[PDB]
Amino acid sequence: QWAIPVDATSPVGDFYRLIPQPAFQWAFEPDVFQKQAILHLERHDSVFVAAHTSAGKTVVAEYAIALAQKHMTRTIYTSPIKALSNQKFRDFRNTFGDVGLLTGDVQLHPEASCLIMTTEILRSMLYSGSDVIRDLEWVIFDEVHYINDVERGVVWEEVLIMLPDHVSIILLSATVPNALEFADWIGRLKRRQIYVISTVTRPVPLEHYLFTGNSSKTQGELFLLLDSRGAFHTKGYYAAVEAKKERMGPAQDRGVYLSLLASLRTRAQLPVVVFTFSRGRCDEQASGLTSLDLTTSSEKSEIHLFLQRCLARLRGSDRQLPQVLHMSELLNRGLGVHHSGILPILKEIVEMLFSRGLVKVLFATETFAMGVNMPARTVVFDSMRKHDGSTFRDLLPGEYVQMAGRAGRRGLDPTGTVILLCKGRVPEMADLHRMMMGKPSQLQSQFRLTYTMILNLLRVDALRVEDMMKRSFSEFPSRKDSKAHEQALAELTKRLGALEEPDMTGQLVDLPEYYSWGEELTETQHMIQRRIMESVNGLKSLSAGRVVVVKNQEHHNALGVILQVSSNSTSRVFTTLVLCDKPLSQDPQDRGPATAEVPYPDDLVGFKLFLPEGPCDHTVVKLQPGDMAAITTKVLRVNGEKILEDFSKRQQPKFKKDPPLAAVTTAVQELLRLAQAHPAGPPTLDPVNDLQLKDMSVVEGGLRARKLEELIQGAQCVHSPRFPAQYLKLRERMQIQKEMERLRFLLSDQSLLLLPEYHQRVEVLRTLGYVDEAGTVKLAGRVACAMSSHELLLTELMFDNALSTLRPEEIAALLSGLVCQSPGDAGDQLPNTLKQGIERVRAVAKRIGEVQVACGLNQTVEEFVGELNFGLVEVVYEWARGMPFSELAGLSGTPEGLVVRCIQRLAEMCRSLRGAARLVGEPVLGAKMETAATLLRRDIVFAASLYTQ
RNA sequence: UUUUUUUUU
């Protein structure tokens, strides 16, 4: 089975009869699904929790560590966000003993038994041994719905395969629908059974209101469009639209926010989290608001004392700059901002002052929605559309669920209200329906090949790269029933030894090739037949007065004339009068499966016109497009309406004995004479030479058919006495051979979709000097292995003598072009040396893109070289001399958070280069970069975290 | 006009 879907609610009745000494004891009672998850964690199973609220999963995520600390063993807790894995660090150090943390720069206590890591580091310490993996029991994958990401979903699937069998896995999730085809994949990729627990109905449910502006001075009206019972209320939506109708940027929005906070302050719904969707819009209304003073005296005193004790670590001028003062003023009134263009010390101050209720309004953004939990009372949105990938799209359902989920608090309020704040135009409830309710999202797999995996797998001998592709989740549906495919192959290989070898010497010489001619020609006509009904020109021909040949299990190439064409052009049902033999029977028991009709030449040229052996009766059948063998050229102007008013009238069981109508008799006699008048079927309405079409495929098909008919009309096998038996036996073996071939291909190695891209990348890799022939890593490959990003470009640049001959205060500016991810530009007040190094680096990028595009890869040289985005070179060059921050702030118009982030991101390459400069043997760039690194990190750019020390 | 991660030796 490999995946056990344990029932969420039914099984557990006795949680304390067994397990009477829980490894951890809370201050309240764990509910049913957490009881079941702990019940399965007791027996050393591997649960897959899928819950809503972040505080329901960490009861398991710390009971597993209480068990880990009880046994002296070790556990690795992995979270994707670098800032989310610090408050967890604080809570695990406060709750019990030693918990080490490892991130891009922090290495706090790398010897504990709760190392907290980002998965991109565990993927880096799986390629080597690292001697920690010998001691694990549990690996708590925290947020496992980042597989659906496009730029990091490959890490979780590179990790989940290489993990050995003895290491148990815990997968916390966010209630995705398709949990049973993923836990089954992990269950049968390893050989352990996996239990799935999924919950709904988070406590303290939430009412989704809608606030539309009116009488912005005091009046606030809230319309209910969703309730505690899931019932959609359209009445509120309608009320909103009329409310917008009677009335029919910053000065109005200020009154909108003062009306919202005026109707909110009258009640106790104070701790309100506004979600804005752009940092300029986020700080604009916070600047323009400018008078609330929502804070009393004692909380003002506590805020002031706390804020100076926390800020007084850093030096003097560094605590007096515009943002710090402005933010302190806002906090003094009780207002905060939490966007991504602010210093991390202020994101941290706002979050640590929001978890104790000393701030009342937060103009947060999605980073607060993901990186922390800290539940608040009332969440208010600000818009419906965001700008993700330059398409300025509408917000999709999965996100909304999370922010709405952090609306209710736990036992400090009855429920939680989520207020949407549509202001510009009507809410357009139609898309609100599928966004605000809807199955959250499936679980995809964004697997792709990078150079790092290829190098770190060629480096090792016992692992092959196609192994990783076969074990990949994007191959799971294909490779699901692999044991059944191989068993079918192995049990039909036995069957192959069975059939006798026939003798074709003489009259049977061309029997196999003839066989081939029979199938393909037939297939061709069907393709041509498809090219007949799919055409718009057939759609003009398809009308009353059309005779067709009908071919299905009931009618065997019986000639019919269509009475009418259905008005519904989707399901083409044709009421058509077709001649058939008068039924000389009423009992289905004499009818049985008969001999498989061998194709004779008389059967393979056109359609053998059936001549009824009995009297010429009629039927009127409701025909499909696929049941008609041919569209005949004849135009019989018969009037369908009277024939319908006669057949449908007569088809009363009581009216089966009506006298025939003249139109029916005339149609039957004319059809019968036409049946006699063509020896094997009249010519069809030619697709090209009669319908005036120009598709090449139909012309090749028609000429191939003509050549095959001429060839088939001379076969010698048709005259042999034992033609049918040997022939049918050959048919059976040929089908078995074809299905075996397809079966082996599906089990073969060419099935992998990305294999040609693997070959092309390997070839381009070997064209540079990184891998010898027959796939053995060379020295440049081993250099490019241990690199963070852009390994190829960095190692090629390092090996060449471009950078070697520059100043240490200039190499930082040269490397600043790889990291900024910001709108870029050139400079004016720059030395000459930087100004020629930029063309050299860009020329190297052009060379790399030209060797990339000259191998088979599809990435144009311009799109590859456009990743090089200089424009922080001057700022980093001035910063890495001793120049203080204020001049940097003045210099140019970019928010000082996206600059400080770039500076640590640069200090992590002038530290990931210590590993390659010490391995190639070039100790003078190492001795310049180990200076250029210690001269760049001195102050609030690299200020230590608050809840770290 | 979003967010975003890549230890040690």
Cβ of A130 less than 7 A from strand B: yes
The closest of A826, A824, A843, A848 to A835, measured between CA atoms, is A826
The two tokens of residue A111 are: 């010897």
How many residues does the structure list for chain A? Answer: 949
* R_g of chain A, CA atoms, integer Å: 38
- Amino acid letter, A697: S
**CA A85, C1' B1: Å apart?**
28
Query: How many other CB atoms are found less than 10 A from the CB of residue A319?
Result: 16
- Amino acid letter, A180: L
Taking the C1' atom of every nucleotide in all shown strands and the CA of A919, the nearest one is B9
Residue A232 β-bridge partners: A226
Phi and psi torsions of A681, nearest 5°: 120, 130
Q: What CA–CA distance (Å, rounded) separates A561 from A584?
A: 23
DSSP letter assigned to residue A557: E
Query: How many other CB atoms are found less than 10 A from the CB of residue A39?
Result: 19
Q: Are A849 and A865 in contact (CB under 8 A)?
A: yes
Q: Are A829 and A874 in contact (CB under 8 A)?
A: yes
Within A789-913, residue ranges assigned H as helices are 791-799, 808-815, 832-853, 861-865, 873-879, 885-891, 896-907, 909-912
Phi and psi torsions of A911, nearest 5°: -115, -20
Taking the C1' atom of every nucleotide in all shown strands and the CA of A370, the nearest one is B3
A 531-550: CB within 7 Å of strand B: none
The closest of A370, A365, A380, A342 to A276, measured between CA atoms, is A365
The two tokens of residue A524 are: 């061709």
Q: What CA–CA distance (Å, rounded) separates A353 from A855?
A: 56
A 98-117: CB within 7 Å of strand B: 102-105, 107, 110
Q: Is A57 assigned to a binding site?
A: yes
Cβ of A782 less than 7 A from strand B: no
Q: Are A275 and A379 in contact (CB under 8 A)?
A: yes
Taking the C1' atom of every nucleotide in all shown strands and the CA of A80, the nearest one is B5
A 34-93: CB within 7 Å of strand B: 80-83
Closest amino acid to nucleotide B7 (CA–C1') = A121
Q: Are A310 and A349 in contact (CB under 8 A)?
A: yes
Q: What CA–CA distance (Å, rounded) separates A2 from A188?
A: 6
H-run or E-run covering A741 = helix A723-747
State the method: cryo-EM
Strands (E), A391-453: 416-420
- Amino acid letter, A684: T
**CA A193, C1' B4: Å apart?**
34
The two tokens of residue A839 are: 């063309």
**CA A90, C1' B6: Å apart?**
23
The closest of A425, A422, A52, A439 to A225, measured between CA atoms, is A422
Q: Are A680 and A607 in contact (CB under 8 A)?
A: yes
Collapsing DSSP states into helix, strand and coil, what is residue A901? helix
Q: What CA–CA distance (Å, rounded) separates A895 from A229?
A: 44
Residue A424 makes CB contacts below 8 A (sequence gap 6+) with: none
**CA A813, C1' B8: Å apart?**
27
Cα angle A890, A892, A895 (rounded to 5 degrees) comes to 90
**Resolution, Å (one decimal):** 6.5
Residue A197 makes CB contacts below 8 A (sequence gap 6+) with: A6, A8, A33, A36, A37, A40, A47, A48, A49, A50
A 359-398: CB within 7 Å of strand B: 365-367, 371, 386-390, 392
3-class SS letters over A555-568: CEEEEEEEEEECCC
- Annotate A368-383 with DSSP letters as a single string: HHHH-----SEEE---
Closest amino acid to nucleotide B5 (CA–C1') = A120
Q: Are A759 and A752 in contact (CB under 8 A)?
A: no
The two tokens of residue A565 are: 């064409």
Q: How far is CA A639 from the centre of its chain?
A: 56
Q: What CA–CA distance (Å, rounded) separates A259 from A294?
A: 15
Q: Is A112 assigned to a binding site?
A: no
Residue A601 makes CB contacts below 8 A (sequence gap 6+) with: A712, A713, A715, A718
Q: What CA–CA distance (Å, rounded) separates A113 from A340?
A: 33
- Amino acid letter, A363: F
The two tokens of residue A823 are: 């709108």
Closest amino acid to nucleotide B1 (CA–C1') = A387
Cα angle A67, A70, A74 (rounded to 5 degrees) comes to 70
Q: What CA–CA distance (Å, rounded) separates A822 from A817?
A: 10
Cα angle A787, A790, A794 (rounded to 5 degrees) comes to 75
**CA A749, C1' B6: Å apart?**
31
Q: What CA–CA distance (Å, rounded) separates A367 from A95?
A: 26
The closest of A148, A203, A185 to A30, measured between CA atoms, is A203
Q: Which of the nucleotides in strand B have any atom less than 7 Å away from a protein CB atom?
A: 1-9
Residue A356 makes CB contacts below 8 A (sequence gap 6+) with: none
Q: What CA–CA distance (Å, rounded) separates A904 from A60?
A: 34
Q: What CA–CA distance (Å, rounded) separates A55 from A61?
A: 10
Phi and psi torsions of A271, nearest 5°: -70, 80
3-class SS letters over A323-342: HHHHHHHHHHHCEEEECCCC
Residue A523 makes CB contacts below 8 A (sequence gap 6+) with: none
Q: What CA–CA distance (Å, rounded) separates A689 from A711?
A: 24
Residue A609 makes CB contacts below 8 A (sequence gap 6+) with: A557, A559, A675, A678, A679, A680, A681
Taking the C1' atom of every nucleotide in all shown strands and the CA of A918, the nearest one is B9
A 635-654: CB within 7 Å of strand B: none
Collapsing DSSP states into helix, strand and coil, what is residue A501? coil
Q: Is A594 assigned to a binding site?
A: no
CA neighbours closer than 13 Å in the CB half-sphere of residue A854: 9
Cα angle A212, A215, A221 (rounded to 5 degrees) comes to 40
Q: Are A723 and A550 in contact (CB under 8 A)?
A: no
**CA A278, C1' B1: Å apart?**
7
Residue A78 β-bridge partners: A117, A141
Collapsing DSSP states into helix, strand and coil, what is residue A887? helix
Q: How many helices (H) does chain A have, and how many strands (E)?
A: 39, 22
Q: What CA–CA distance (Å, rounded) separates A550 from A609?
A: 11
Provide the pairing of β-strand A546-551 with A378-380: unpaired
**CA A130, C1' B9: Å apart?**
9
Cβ of A338 less than 7 A from strand B: no
Q: Are A109 and A100 in contact (CB under 8 A)?
A: yes
Phi and psi torsions of A92, nearest 5°: -80, -25
CA neighbours closer than 13 Å in the CB half-sphere of residue A904: 17
The two tokens of residue A446 are: 């964004």
**CA A124, C1' B8: Å apart?**
10
Tell me the Ramachandran region of residue A44: left when phi exceeds 0, alpha when psi lies from -120 to 50, beta otherwise.
left
Q: What CA–CA distance (Å, rounded) separates A895 from A883?
A: 18
Residue A141 β-bridge partners: A78, A171
The two tokens of residue A734 are: 């040929």
Q: What CA–CA distance (Å, rounded) separates A229 from A242?
A: 26
Q: What CA–CA distance (Å, rounded) separates A75 from A96?
A: 14
Q: Is the dihedral of CA A532, A536, A537, A543 positive or negative?
A: positive
Tell me the Ramachandran region of residue A666: left when phi exceeds 0, alpha when psi lies from -120 to 50, beta otherwise.
alpha
**CA A122, C1' B7: Å apart?**
8
Taking the C1' atom of every nucleotide in all shown strands and the CA of A121, the nearest one is B7
Q: Is A619 assigned to a binding site?
A: no
Domains and CATH numbers, chain A: 32-198 (3.40.50.300), 202-270+377-441 (3.40.50.300), 456-492+731-749 (no CATH), 511-584+596-719 (2.30.30.1160), 759-948 (1.10.3380.30)
Q: In a 10 Å sphere around its CB, with 0-12 CB exposed, 13-18 middle and 19+ buried, how is residue A577 labelled?
A: buried
Q: How far is CA A755 from the centre of its chain?
A: 21
Q: What CA–CA distance (Å, rounded) separates A209 from A420?
A: 6
Q: Side by side, which strands form the sheet with A74-78?
A: A107-108, A101-102, A116-117, A74-78, A136-141, A168-171
A 708-767: CB within 7 Å of strand B: none
**CA A782, C1' B8: Å apart?**
17
The two tokens of residue A812 are: 């930082």
Residue A332 makes CB contacts below 8 A (sequence gap 6+) with: A295, A300, A303, A304
CA neighbours closer than 13 Å in the CB half-sphere of residue A290: 8
**CA A787, C1' B6: Å apart?**
9
Cβ of A915 less than 7 A from strand B: yes
Could you identify the residue written with the tokens 């359902």?
Answer: A397
Residue A59 makes CB contacts below 8 A (sequence gap 6+) with: A26, A30, A34, A38
Collapsing DSSP states into helix, strand and coil, what is residue A93? helix
A 256-295: CB within 7 Å of strand B: 277-281
Query: How many other CB atoms are found less than 10 A from the CB of residue A806?
Result: 16
Q: What CA–CA distance (Å, rounded) separates A906 from A912?
A: 10
Q: In a 10 Å sphere around its CB, with 0-12 CB exposed, 13-18 middle and 19+ buried, how is residue A407 labelled?
A: buried
How are the residues of chain A apportioned to helix, strand and coil, as percentages rounded to the nearest 5?
Answer: 45, 10, 40
Q: Is A629 assigned to a binding site?
A: no
The closest of A362, A391, A227, A360 to A295, measured between CA atoms, is A360
Q: What CA–CA distance (Å, rounded) separates A867 from A862?
A: 9
Q: What CA–CA distance (Å, rounded) separates A418 from A210?
A: 8
H-run or E-run covering A630 = strand A628-635
- Amino acid letter, A698: V
**CA A323, C1' B1: Å apart?**
22
The closest of A946, A155, A94 to A114, measured between CA atoms, is A94
Provide the pairing of β-strand A136-141 with A168-171: parallel
CA-CA distances (angstroms) from residue A281 to A164, A284, A287, A336, A391?
49, 5, 10, 14, 18
Q: Side by side, which strands form the sheet with A574-578?
A: A619-623, A574-578, A556-565, A546-551, A628-635
Residue A564 β-bridge partners: A575
Q: What CA–CA distance (Å, rounded) separates A454 from A465?
A: 7
Collapsing DSSP states into helix, strand and coil, what is residue A101? strand
Q: What CA–CA distance (Å, rounded) separates A285 from A108?
A: 40
The two tokens of residue A802 are: 């471009």
Cβ of A402 less than 7 A from strand B: no
Q: Are A84 and A370 in contact (CB under 8 A)?
A: yes
The two tokens of residue A640 are: 């369908």
Cβ of A151 less than 7 A from strand B: yes
Q: What CA–CA distance (Å, rounded) separates A387 from A277?
A: 8
Could you identify the residue written with the tokens 């030096």?
Answer: A315
Q: What CA–CA distance (Å, rounded) separates A208 from A231?
A: 11
Q: Are A110 and A89 in contact (CB under 8 A)?
A: no
Tell me the Ramachandran region of residue A411: left when phi exceeds 0, alpha when psi lies from -120 to 50, beta otherwise.
left
Q: What CA–CA distance (Å, rounded) separates A618 from A578?
A: 6
CA neighbours closer than 13 Å in the CB half-sphere of residue A914: 11
Q: Is A54 assigned to a binding site?
A: yes
